[PDB]
Ligand binder design. Structure first.
Ligand SMILES: CCCCCCCC/C=C\CCCCCCCC(=O)OC[C@H](COP(=O)(O)OCC[N+](C)(C)C)OC(=O)CCCCCCC/C=C\CCCCCCCC
Ligand SMILES: CCCCCCCC/C=C\CCCCCCCC(=O)OC[C@H](COP(=O)(O)OCC[N+](C)(C)C)OC(=O)CCCCCCC/C=C\CCCCCCCC
Ligand SMILES: CCCCCCCC/C=C\CCCCCCCC(=O)OC[C@H](COP(=O)(O)OCC[N+](C)(C)C)OC(=O)CCCCCCC/C=C\CCCCCCCC
Ligand SMILES: CCCCCCCC/C=C\CCCCCCCC(=O)OC[C@H](COP(=O)(O)OCC[N+](C)(C)C)OC(=O)CCCCCCC/C=C\CCCCCCCC
Ligand SMILES: CCCCCCCC/C=C\CCCCCCCC(=O)OC[C@H](COP(=O)(O)OCC[N+](C)(C)C)OC(=O)CCCCCCC/C=C\CCCCCCCC
Lengths: 101, 49, 140, 225, 99
């Protein structure tokens, strides 16, 4: 369904928010200068979950596969279509006379 | 004062050409738009001949 | 029933060469009258089918409209030249169509549409033997 | 770490990415604009299509009975029939093709040189993996530091990394087999090699055993609605 | 049986699009997390197999008519994915952790 597309959007948004959080946390260190050297569990969990949902949505957004066997889409092609030959059309048929000229 | 023993490697230069970088950005995005229109028109004309 | 739906239906009906001239001409007229500006150049290929259907449908009134629009948009175009040739053939005007196709051939020799249209004229005239000979020569 | 200037991001990091992206788009659109089909006369297209037919016959003549196939063979490669025997015949084009081939990489290198001059003397970003010290002279052009970690990169090599890592994005957005990246002439010899090859080819009518392989299983019929 | 060039080309194109998108996203995520050095590269491989699993789910059953074999699902355009992964990794690790 189309909602899949919407899903991926929020995923990116989630990732974007993670970035902001990470940036802020970096400022934290740039003002604390302590031996933490570790991201908050909340931000990494949020980033990983956003990655998972965004990838799952993207896989759907990629599209639908197509079968290799050439007789798949040609199965429904009745003989009433392949014979038309659009380049070799002739307009000397009963259609013109029968219909309004 | 301040001293830069390494020519201030980690700071933007005072003589940065803002009026050139911004100009090239916003005169090249427009160039991309114009060339996209040109490519579409040429493709249509080649298809129709 | 949105213009995208009939656009997709027309695309399908063009991908496989159908000849239900009535249905395709009705859908094309609706598209070019109500939703002409709703989409871009993708109607232009439609403007081909719409006239051909007209020549198949016999409703010549919009054939002139489509032809004039295409000609005013695409002057000196071999595809539009063949399309004018079909318009001429719609009323069995064969000499002018043959002259136009000869002019197209002398302007561009690698064009394949003109030969097909001229042999279609020949087979419409009933000269089956000469049409077969012309096709044999063209395939060579 | 290093307390890099924040203004280096808004004017040396993002503009490089934007420049690379839109220069790739510009290059692809200029490439499609420049391409013009060379005029072909009747003889060349005719012989090309004839050899096309010959090759497709060689590929899948198995679905054609034996007599039709060996009559094809007589027509193609046999003295008496005559076909394949009585069928044969600073310059501007070289300069144009050389310029077209050159314009696929050289604009990227010229953009790189212009970027290296314009954005010389910065430290733009830290490459997150420990590159070797011997790679220092090309990653850190325009920096006089000696003990600086090799993972810090100047503007030119950052742009190079951007142009290397953006081709997949180009294929993603522009379309499949796009032209924005970084990376028959003779018919007589073609006629002779087709002669020899189709001489070497054999026949295997694939319909000799279709019925028996069809009789084995019942015909699929569901989904008739 | 009878492979059709258009369908196999479309399948290759959709697989390449999915791989490129997932590699770019994985680069962005690795830059966000601040992974540095070999520990980063391994993550990419992990991301790749994750995508493979998803592709296995996407192809699902009866995939024999979609691909000759599952191999392009796993190693299809791995280097092309790696280049974009490292680009986006550097991008995000630069505009998140460096500043
Ligand atoms: C993925 C995008 C990364 C997320 C943003 C993280 C970040 O770096 O967040 C911090 C900045 C706040 O920078 P500031 O204006 O407060 O200081 C500027 C000081 N001055 C005014 C003197 C120049 O916010 C921002 O979005 C950074 C703005 C540029 C990066 C966004 C472009 C990508 C979309
Ligand atoms: C200092 C502001 C943003 C405006 C940029 C527009 C410039 C432009 O016109 O470049 C168009 C590009 C690509 O074309 P497209 O993706 O918009 O359309 C689909 C591509 N087509 C038409 C081939 C199917 O757009 C883009 O990359 C922009 C999205 C990133
Ligand atoms: C005012 C500021 C100027 C606005 C931006 C200039 C527009 C450049 C767009 C462009 O059209 O340029 C892109 C080419 C693509 O490469 P190409 O050779 O395949 O197409 C070129 C075919 N040809 C060789 C026959 C010309 O690359 C190039 O030359 C880029 C040239 C790099 C020089 C930067 C200009 C510095 C600012 C002044
Ligand atoms: C945080 C870092 C993440 C990086 C983001 C990259 C991954 C995000 C990607 C995709 C999500 C968007 C989903 C919308 C559906 C689009 C595809 C679709 O099924 O819908 C169809 C239409 C038209 O199909 P098409 O011919 O245009 O597609 C090309 C056809 N094919 C793939 C066979 C070549 O799609 C359209 O509406 C036209 C628009 C097509 C998609 C535009 C997205 C690309 C724009 C920017 C990518 C990166 C540029 C800036 C990054 C610089 C950082 C270094
Ligand atoms: C959660 C982790 C599960 C991952 C397992 C996996 O990687 O997936 C394996 C199977 C694909 O192989 P298969 O067992 O279906 O047999 C072969 C299919 N054949 C007969 C068409 C060749 O996918 C499947 O789970 C089948 C999915 C069907 C969903 C109902």
């Amino acid at each position: 369904p189309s909602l899949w597309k919407g899903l991926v959007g929020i995923g990116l948004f989630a990732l974007a928010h993670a970035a902001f959080s990470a940036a802020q946390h970096r400022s934290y260190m740039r003002l604390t200068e302590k031996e933490d050297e570790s991201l908050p569990i909340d931000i990494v969990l949020q980033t990983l979950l956003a990655f998972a949902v965004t990838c799952y949505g993207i896989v759907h957004i990629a599209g639908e596969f197509k079968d290799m066997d050439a007789t798949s889409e040609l199965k429904n092609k009745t003989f009433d279509t392949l014979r038309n030959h659009p380049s070799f059309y002739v307009f000397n048929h009963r259609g013109r006379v029968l219909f309004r000229p | 004062t301040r001293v830069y023993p390494s020519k201030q490697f980690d700071v933007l230069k005072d003589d940065y050409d803002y009026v050139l970088i911004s100009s090239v950005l916003f005169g090249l995005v427009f160039a991309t738009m114009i060339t996209k229109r040109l490519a579409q028109v040429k493709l249509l004309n080649r298809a129709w001949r | 029933v949105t213009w995208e739906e009939m656009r997709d239906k027309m695309r399908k009906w063009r991908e496989e060469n159908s000849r239900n001239s009535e249905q395709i001409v009705e859908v094309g007229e609706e598209l070019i009258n109500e939703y002409a500006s709703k989409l871009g150049d993708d109607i232009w290929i439609i403007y081909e089918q719409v006239m051909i259907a007209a020549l198949d449908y016999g409703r010549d009134d919009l054939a002139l409209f489509c032809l004039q629009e295409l000609r005013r948009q695409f002057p000196g175009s071999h595809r539009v030249k063949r399309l004018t040739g079909m318009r001429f053939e719609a009323m069995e005007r064969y000499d002018d169509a043959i002259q136009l196709y000869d002019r197209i051939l002398q302007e561009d020799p690698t064009n394949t549409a003109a030969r097909k249209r001229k042999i279609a004229i020949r087979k419409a005239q009933g000269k089956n033997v000469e049409a077969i000979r012309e096709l044999n020569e063209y395939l060579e | 770490e290093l307390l890099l200037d924040s203004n280096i991001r808004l004017w040396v990091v993002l503009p490089i990415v934007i420049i690379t992206f839109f220069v790739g788009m510009i290059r692809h659109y200029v490439s499609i604009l420049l391409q013009s089909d060379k005029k072909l006369t009747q003889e060349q297209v005719s012989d090309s299509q004839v050899l096309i037919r010959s090759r497709v016959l060689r590929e899948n003549g198995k679905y054609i009975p034996k007599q039709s196939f060996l009559t094809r063979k007589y027509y193609f490669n046999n003295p008496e029939d005559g076909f394949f025997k009585k069928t044969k015949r600073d310059p501007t084009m070289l300069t144009d093709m050389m310029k077209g081939n050159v314009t696929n990489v050289l604009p990227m290198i010229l953009i790189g040189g212009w970027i290296n001059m314009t954005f010389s003397g910065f430290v733009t970003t830290k490459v997150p993996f420990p590159l070797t010290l011997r790679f220092k002279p090309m990653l850190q052009q325009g920096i006089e530091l000696l003990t600086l970690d090799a993972s810090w990169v100047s503007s030119a090599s950052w742009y190079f990394l951007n142009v290397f890592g953006l081709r997949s994005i180009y294929s993603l957005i522009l379309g499949q087999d796009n032209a924005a990246d970084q990376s028959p002439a003779d018919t007589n010899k073609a006629f002779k090699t087709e002669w020899e090859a189709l001489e070497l080819t054999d026949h295997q009518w694939a319909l000799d055993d279709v019925e028996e392989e069809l009789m084995a299983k019942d015909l699929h019929f569901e989904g008739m609605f | 049986p009878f492979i059709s060039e258009a369908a196999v080309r479309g399948n290759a194109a959709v697989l390449d699009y999915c791989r490129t998108s997932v590699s770019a996203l994985s680069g962005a995520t690795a830059g966000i997390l601040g992974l540095t050095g070999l520990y980063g590269f391994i993550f990419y491989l992990l991301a790749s197999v994750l995508l493979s699993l998803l592709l296995i789910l996407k192809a699902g059953r009866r995939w024999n008519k979609y691909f000759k074999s599952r191999r392009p699902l796993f190693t299809g355009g791995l280097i092309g994915g790696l280049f974009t992964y490292v680009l986006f990794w550097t991008f995000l690790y630069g505009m998140v952790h460096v500043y």
